[PDB]
Design a protein around this ligand. Sequence first.
Ligand SMILES: Cc1ncnc(OCCN(C)C)c1-c1ccc(C[n+]2cc(NC(=O)Nc3cccc(C(F)(F)F)c3)on2)nc1
Length: 161
Amino acid sequence: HMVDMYIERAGDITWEKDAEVTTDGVYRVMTRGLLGSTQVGVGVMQEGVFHTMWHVTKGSALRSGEGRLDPYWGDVKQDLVSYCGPWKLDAAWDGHSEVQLLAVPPGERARNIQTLPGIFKTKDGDIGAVALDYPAGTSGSPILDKCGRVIGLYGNGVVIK
Ligand SMILES: Cc1ncnc(OCCN(C)C)c1-c1ccc(C[n+]2cc(NC(=O)Nc3cccc(C(F)(F)F)c3)on2)nc1
C-alpha cells in the first residue's frame, strides 16, 4: 500500500459578492506515488484542525508540507474526519437562503458558485444538497453561508433534523 499522502493549499475561506448565478484555509488532498501526483479530495483547515471526508483519506495520516498530521476524530457513517483536534464546524444551513460552493477540482483553480440548494427525499430519509455536478476529487470542498461560516462539504449532503 502507498503510504504517501499530502495536502496543498489552494486558497482562503471567503464569501464573494460577485459570483456565478497549520494555518486557516482550504487545502486540496493529494497522493504522490509511482506514476505521479493525483488529487483524491479536498479539505478545510480551521482553528488548527484539518477537516475532510473519511472516504478521501480513509484514516490515512497526512503530511502538511514538512510536519505530519495524524487523525483525531472521525465517523464512517457520517463520512467525516478531523486531524489534530475535535470537530469545530458546528455551523449548518439556515434552510431557505442561498449558499456558495467553494469548488476546488483537480488541475484547476478554486472558485465560488452562488446557488440555492435543493431538498431530496431519499428512501432512507429527507436530505438537503447543492444542485451542482463536479468531478470526484472535488468531493470535500466547503459550502459557505451568507455570514461567512462553513456549513458542510461537497460529496455527501445533510439530513433534515
Ligand atoms: C443527493 C441526490 N439524490 C438524488 N439525486 C441526486 O442527483 C441527481 C442528478 N444526478 C444524476 C447528477 C442527488 C445529488 C444532487 C446533487 C449532488 C451534488 N453534490 C452536492 C454535494 N454536497 C452537499 O450538498 N453538501 C451539503 C451539506 C450540507 C448542507 C448543504 C446545503 F445546505 F447546501 F444543502 C449541502 O455533493 N454532491 N449530489 C447528489
